[PDB]
Amino acid sequence: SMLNQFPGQYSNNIFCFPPIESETKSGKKASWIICVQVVQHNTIIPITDEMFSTDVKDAVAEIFTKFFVEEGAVRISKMTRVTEGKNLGKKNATTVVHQAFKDALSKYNRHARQKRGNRGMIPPMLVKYFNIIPKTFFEEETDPIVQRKRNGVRAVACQQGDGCILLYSRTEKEFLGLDNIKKELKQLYLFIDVRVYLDGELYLHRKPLQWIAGQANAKTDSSELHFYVFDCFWSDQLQMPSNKRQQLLTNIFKQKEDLTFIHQVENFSVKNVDEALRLKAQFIKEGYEGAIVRNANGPYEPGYNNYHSAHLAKLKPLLDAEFILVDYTQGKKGKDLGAILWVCELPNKKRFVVTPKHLTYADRYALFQKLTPALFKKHLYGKELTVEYAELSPKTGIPLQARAVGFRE
DNA sequence: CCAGTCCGACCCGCATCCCGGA
DNA sequence: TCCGGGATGCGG
DNA sequence: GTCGGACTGG
């Protein structure tokens, strides 16, 4: 009875949600299937209706998933072991099996996003290269364009069938609030083609990313953010080269100067790498996150399947700091269960976890296996851990987007 | 052989909801 | 009541 | 956002 509350089939005591079908960049169709099974004493057992109100002794709920290209190899993830419910001491308490279906249903709903194959939402183009400009950027018919990179939130604007303006995010989530932007967008769409997409950045200079992201994600906001547009495209002309999209975007902002919150990102032409680098250093002096380099011939490649376009480059400083190692832990789900994770402490006694980079999962599995608090206290506790990150948390000092690259000695 | 794709884990910060005890 | 903690799901 | 790993497409 209860398995009918979730979509999918139930066979062999294994509940499989209906496949999510999508198109790859090569054109082949792909299928994504997430399943739930319960294992007690190393064997699969049926999923009873009572398994939603009372745990079974020695029973673990396992979430796994299948992905394959049409007529291709079938890739199955490691098991996500759900060993206990959540809110275990409240009226909200869920069961081992019930919580695993909530987790699996949550994955199922969100996985349908950013997939090729709507509401007209097209995922924004993503950047592949980081602090590297391919030489082919300067071996084209036109010189690449350098723009400022702003440390805010990604957004794409378009106009639905009705007069409403649609502002959505990297993962095709509709933004709420932001009425100062939408009203000026509604006025700008009176002067231009009503099927263009305005691709840009929600941002307010000298405000931290954390505040910007808070205002964009909250249902309401102080209506103080700006929309800096750096690209445009049409759904039926995605192959339009970058320089052409920039030229048409310039003509779009030549249709209305009465804009207070919507601005076109300035375009700089560079003949070589050094001029792009000089603009990067200048932008960092002005307080910006860095520079974006756009190949003049690149089409607009949406972020389907989180695709990163090879025709874009991200010039942004990579920060390296040192932090005292104080503990260690592991991941909890799938391939990261039993995989080592570091724990560092800041001067202000605040702690944070860092995922190790340049290590194999074999190394991570082994490290967490050989070690216990006794041997950790003898050696690794107290050492300096080299951490690559992008910025410091302004309220805590914690390095953000951090990854551990190794120790000093 | 070798990039190109794609998936599936993880990080911190914020926003929002349900709780349930000072 | 009202301020937390837990859980979830966004952003980077 | 970051990353490793496995498959893809030659």
Numbering used by the authors: 0 to 116, 120 to 411
What do the authors report?
AsfvLIG is composed of 419 amino acids and is one of the smallest DNA ligases identified to date. However, unlike the homologous proteins (such as HsLIG1 and SusLIG1), the fidelity of AsfvLIG is very low.
One unsealed C:G pair, one unsealed C:T pair, and one sealed C:T pair were, respectively, captured at the catalytic sites of the three catalytic form structures, referred to as AsfvLIG:CG, AsfvLIG:CT1, and AsfvLIG:CT2 hereafter. Our structures represent several different states of the reaction: the AsfvLIG:CG complex structure captured the Watson–Crick C:G pair prior to ligation, whereas AsfvLIG:CT1 and AsfvLIG:CT2 captured the mismatched C:T pair prior to and after the ligation process, respectively. The structures belong to two different space groups: P212121 for AsfvLIG:CT2 and P21 for both AsfvLIG:CG and AsfvLIG:CT1. However, as indicated by the low root mean square deviation values (rmsd, about 0.75 Å based on the superposition of 404 pairs of Cα atoms) among them, the three complex structures are very similar to each other. AsfvLIG is assembled like a ring-shaped clamp and encircles the DNA duplex in its central channel.
